[PDB]
């Protein structure tokens, strides 16, 4: 059967947008952990959802985009 999808349902079903929509092994996955006033970058040896990290990432890069866009400006 040939189906036509909209953006919404597509993005919920398809991994092409943000990565896998379930937990997979992400090679090089790191996080920052505090050990007595010291930041350490440590590996996270546990599967996680790439799309879940992407929704954080998309907003964060929108913010840093705005920062560059305004850095030579008045406001």
């Amino acid at each position: 059967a040939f189906e036509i999808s909209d953006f919404k349902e597509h993005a919920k079903k398809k991994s092409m947008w943000a990565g896998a929509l379930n937990k997979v092994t992400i090679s090089g996955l790191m996080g920052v952990f505090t050990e007595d006033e010291d930041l350490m970058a440590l590996p996270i040896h546990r599967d996680h959802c790439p799309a879940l990290l992407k929704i954080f990432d998309e907003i964060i890069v929108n913010a840093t985009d705005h920062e560059r866009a305004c850095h030579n400006k008045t406001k």
Binding site: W17, A18, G19, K54, R68
Partner: protein, 243 residues
Amino acid sequence: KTINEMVVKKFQQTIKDKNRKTTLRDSCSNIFIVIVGSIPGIEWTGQRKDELSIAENVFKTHYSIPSSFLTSMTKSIVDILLQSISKKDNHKQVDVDKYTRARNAGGKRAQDCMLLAAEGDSALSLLRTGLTLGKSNPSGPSFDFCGMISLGGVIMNACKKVTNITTDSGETIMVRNEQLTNNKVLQGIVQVLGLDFNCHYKTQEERAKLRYGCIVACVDQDLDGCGKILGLLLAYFHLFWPQ
């Protein structure tokens, strides 16, 4: 690639082996780099933006890595490369081939032990027969103060596989050949006696650092074995340690 090109250059410079070929994995496997900034005009391989897409020549044409950073990096990397050249390939090994040590080699009575260097293995069979006369020869030697090693047939001569380099300081130096360096017999006997090539052995507290303090060549009596290879052995010890 930039770091690798410099690392290869200085590795071949610093190494006097001058033959080994290392690639990017050797160059870079000890590196952790952080790169942060903006690049105009890049493209990606998908929405996730895992991989940026660009012509390599953008950097070859436009960017330059400061040489102080390249030099520092190459220095650290080649230090590790030489440490891995002194280790790995050259790690802890074992005794030499057809060699029977004495019970008192390199100890408190190290100087009073002999090395009966023989010509093959049938001679070592004779010497093993004879150094084990237990109570039938109370005045003879045994393995408490005697060892055995084979000369491998005919010794390589060193008097024509070596070159003199008169240094600009004045004192000339004597560099071996790669064929003479890699002979198994001579490497084995300078490993057994603990010899050194930049020690002239002129005083006695530097001759007390030999693993046992005499060599005795047990060779044949036909002219092929008494004249030839005994003469080449004498020539080797003349050319490197006449003292």
